[PDB]
Design an enzyme around this catalytic site. Sequence first.
Site, PDB file in Angstrom:
ATOM      1  N   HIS A  25       1.769   4.287  -3.063  1.00 28.48           N
ATOM      2  CA  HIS A  25       1.622   5.703  -2.897  1.00 28.48           C
ATOM      3  C   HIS A  25       2.916   6.237  -3.575  1.00 28.48           C
ATOM      4  CE1 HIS A  25      -2.011   6.165  -0.816  1.00 28.48           C
ATOM      5  NE2 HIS A  25      -1.538   5.823   0.329  1.00 28.48           N
ATOM      6  N   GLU A  71      -5.747   6.751  -2.059  1.00 31.24           N
ATOM      7  CA  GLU A  71      -5.990   5.410  -1.277  1.00 31.24           C
ATOM      8  C   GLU A  71      -6.588   4.594  -1.786  1.00 31.24           C
ATOM      9  OE1 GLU A  71      -4.303   5.536   1.364  1.00 31.24           O
ATOM     10  OE2 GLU A  71      -4.287   7.739   1.774  1.00 31.24           O
ATOM     11  N   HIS A  74       0.815  -1.067  -0.176  1.00 34.20           N
ATOM     12  CA  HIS A  74      -0.014   0.105   0.096  1.00 34.20           C
ATOM     13  C   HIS A  74       1.053   1.263  -0.056  1.00 34.20           C
ATOM     14  CE1 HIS A  74      -3.673   2.237   1.357  1.00 34.20           C
ATOM     15  NE2 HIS A  74      -2.853   2.885   1.772  1.00 34.20           N
ATOM     16  N   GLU A  75       1.813   1.401   1.073  1.00 30.54           N
ATOM     17  CA  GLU A  75       2.647   2.407   1.056  1.00 30.54           C
ATOM     18  C   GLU A  75       3.631   2.674  -0.127  1.00 30.54           C
ATOM     19  OE1 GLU A  75       0.637   2.609   4.504  1.00 30.54           O
ATOM     20  OE2 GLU A  75       1.375   3.929   3.158  1.00 30.54           O
TER      21      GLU A  75
END
EC number: 3.4.24.89
Length: 194
Positions: A120, A159, A116-117
């Site tokens: 980003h 997100e 997830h990070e």
Amino acid sequence: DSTTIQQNKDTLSQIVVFPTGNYDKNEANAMVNRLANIDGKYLNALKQNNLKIKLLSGKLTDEKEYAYLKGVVPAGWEGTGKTWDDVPGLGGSTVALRIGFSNKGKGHDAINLELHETAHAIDHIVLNDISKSAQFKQIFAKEGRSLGNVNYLGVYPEEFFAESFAYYYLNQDTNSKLKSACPQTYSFLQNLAK
Ligand SMILES: [Zn+2]
């Protein structure tokens, strides 16, 4: 495949930064192994921009570069008595990840913390905030709720992009789950990786 994972682990040996102090080294290795699932093109693009994937043995806000987040209530988190001090991961212009906190519910909502990070950072550094591009915004309008967390993923396209990317690359289960729930998002990520 087994040899593709090793190739990406090689690329990651110049991206990942391990912390000072003692920690579960096998678990830190597990996180690197999960990052090796990401398409190597993205990993080499992060390396070209000198993005570092910092594994932490303490709290996010214990790092001097994140001290500004000490005491800060994340967007959408008010009233719970939890702040960035409690958040295990951050991604965007940098990437920082607490060792041991990969799984969903370990202080965060993502199917996998490190993917997830890192999504980003790929979104922002490599792809010029593609989650805010006109094309992804259209897809997000139709499919942005279909991974759940409708008042978070369904509200912030960055997100939803990060979570979709994590589903796409975590494992075969989450990849087929994305394909069923968000067919246009899945095709978008396919075309991006092509
Ligand atoms: Zn996020």
